[PDB]
Ligand binder design. Structure first.
Ligand code: MOO
Length: 322
């Protein structure tokens, strides 16, 4: 029987981070505890949007907040809960699978959506209201329409199988509306939906789902075979930023996220209890040691880190940022 520590957090350093950061932050935890004897790092892994909402709406206090989408910090935390943030890593949306997945040896970059259209094929993605990988899965599928010249890709895979709706904005931008989390109501024969993307890893391993909308790093961390989606739709390239911006996702609470290159962001909240200790953890993260942890885990780091609001940043961190 799990204790409260075994359920919740599965001196004190409280860190709320993204699900895809579970592997590098686990190695960062062990290294930080090795350098600091009496320090117990307590990590809570959740979708980045709900990780932010714990601080901004639930009144929870964290020392370190790390998101899969850096932009959630200035749009939701700044200026009441945050005065600064730093872009530290990059990632890539892929479609993961294993040997057991149906149509495995036959799926490639030019037919992935056609495979997902099949009634026997089941696929997974996380909750877009809570997780970046969840809303990014919708972004990838919608952008695939204009790339492959097929205006029915998003309708067949998402609109006809969930509670998601779509409207066209005045500038031609597509806007995806995500209803209440319980009213998403996915077609069980076609879609499996979790709160965060990494909980769906177990589903792909057993063959409960055939394909999974997830990051490249997570696929390499688990050893899954994957489909390298075109740079124009996979949110991996800085050059295709103008193309990615033509799709937006509105959450149930009215918050709008925009298609952009996947850029991870970190910050130390304004109401942090151990801000001194948090500084040292972020220093290890943005320093050479943190950089090598990401490279070894298949996640490319932004070296040097790009920060905003440097006049509010602690002095120890200003030597590691741009
Ligand atoms: O915040 Mo995630 O790394 O899209 O579970």
């Amino acid at each position: 029987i799990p204790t409260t520590e075994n359920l919740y957090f599965q001196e004190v350093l409280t860190v709320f981070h993204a699900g895809s950061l579970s592997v590098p932050f686990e190695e960062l935890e062990a290294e930080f505890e090795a350098q600091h004897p009496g320090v117990d790092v307590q990590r809570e892994a959740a979708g980045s949007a709900q990780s932010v909402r714990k601080i901004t709406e639930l009144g929870k206090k964290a020392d370190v907040l790390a998101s899969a989408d850096y932009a959630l910090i200035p749009s939701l935390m700044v200026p009441e809960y945050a005065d600064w943030y730093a872009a530290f890593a990059r990632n890539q949306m892929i479609l993961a699978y294993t040997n057991e997945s149906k149509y495995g040896d036959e799926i490639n970059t030019d037919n992935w959506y056609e495979i997902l259209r099949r009634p026997d094929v089941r696929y997974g993605f996380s909750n877009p209201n809570d997780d970046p990988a969840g809303y990014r899965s919708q972004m990838v599928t919608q952008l695939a329409e204009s790339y492959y010249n097929d205006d029915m890709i998003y309708d067949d895979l998402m609109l006809a199988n969930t509670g998601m709706t779509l409207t066209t904005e005045e500038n031609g931008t597509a806007l995806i509306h995500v209803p209440a989390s319980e009213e998403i109501s996915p077609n069980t024969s076609k879609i499996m939906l979790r709160s965060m993307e990494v909980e769906l890893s177990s589903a792909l391993e057993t063959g409960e789902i055939d394909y999974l909308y997830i990051y490249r790093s997570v696929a390499e961390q688990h050893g899954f075979e994957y489909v390298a989606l075109p740079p124009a739709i996979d949110l991996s390239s800085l050059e295709y930023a103008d193309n990615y911006s033509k799709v937006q996702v509105e959450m149930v609470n009215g918050e709008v996220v925009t298609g952009s290159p996947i850029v991870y962001g970190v910050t130390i909240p304004n109401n942090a209890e151990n801000s001194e200790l948090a500084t040292e953890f972020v220093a290890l993260l943005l320093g050479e040691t943190g950089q090598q942890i990401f490279i070894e885990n298949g996640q490319p780091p932004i070296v040097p880190a790009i920060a905003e609001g440097k006049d509010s940043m602690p002095e120890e961190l200003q030597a590691l940022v741009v």
